[PDB]
Amino acid sequence: VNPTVFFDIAVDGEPLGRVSFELFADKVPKTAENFRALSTGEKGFGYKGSCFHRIIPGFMCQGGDFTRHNGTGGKSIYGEKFEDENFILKHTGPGILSMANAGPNTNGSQFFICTAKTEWLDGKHVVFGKVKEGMNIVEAMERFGSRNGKTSKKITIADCGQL
């Protein structure tokens, strides 16, 4: 069975709500496991306390830089980066969870949640999960973004783990 993880989202320290994700371990086990472990913090580091540094209304919310907290960092449980596992799954619409990268085979910890269909990213970013509950939380995060993604409040993962 596919694991489930949750994010408790805060806005300038004030609670907003919980988003949970199904992780497609059945299709992308190595990428799903990276995200799962980072959501539990079981390796001594992970998503807890990090922010969504790039939010662009109409497109996506991106976060996962827990090493520099500014969009230039992050690391996987396998080393700084790891390869593209496969591109079986597509960016079909809102709620898709997919890996950010700096080109081929540069997955770290940064990820994005789609708020629309982003099919031009197919075959370049590894899709590995989907929002299960709390998509309205993600919709609510959008208004703190902008055209270039700078956020007007600090949107943070106040808590996260496995369900």
Partner: protein, 170 residues
């Protein structure tokens, strides 16, 4: 009030467009990977005795969005065309940026400056003469820069302003 100049920084990804702009605006350099969506900055300077306001658009090198450039190319007055002297592909990518600018603005007379960045680095694969010859064939200045050492940073932006001045009195 002082004249404003609309400068646009273009070029392939990772050549140093943002590092150059942040050196100009903020006078510091960090060696981190922070790929640009789009950023805009303002700075007042003195050039050839004349005070002016630089409006700088720092654009995305991200190659997949090459069809998204027409509007900022129509709006911009002058273009800093940046490549890195240790990346021959970024030098080859320059031609496509210039052709796109000329096409979009439907003119052979667009203010531009060719900038060879990262000249602090030992692994140079594009010679100075190679870039000087290209700039000569374009009819535009060439300036070598380092965002890391600040070599040539002011010179590149200021020269582009000089090129826009020479065009608006034409």
């Amino acid at each position: 009030s002082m004249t404003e100049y609309k400068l646009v920084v273009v070029g392939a990804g990772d050549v140093g467009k943002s590092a150059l702009t942040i050196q100009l605006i903020q006078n510091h350099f960090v060696d981190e990977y922070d790929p640009t969506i789009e950023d805009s900055y303002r700075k007042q300077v003195v050039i050839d005795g004349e005070t002016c306001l630089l409006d700088i658009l720092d654009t995305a090198g991200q190659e997949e969005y090459s069809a998204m450039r027409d509007q900022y190319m129509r709006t911009g007055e002058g273009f800093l065309c940046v490549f890195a002297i240790n990346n021959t592909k970024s030098f080859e990518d320059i031609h496509h940026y210039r052709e796109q600018i000329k096409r979009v603005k439907d003119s052979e007379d667009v203010p531009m400056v060719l900038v060879g960045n990262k000249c602090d680095l030992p692994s140079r694969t594009v010679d100075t003469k190679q870039a000087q010859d290209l700039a000569r064939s374009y009819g535009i200045p060439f300036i070598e820069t380092s965002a890391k050492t600040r070599q040539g940073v002011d010179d590149a932006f200021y020269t582009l302003v000089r090129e826009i001045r020479k065009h608006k009195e034409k």
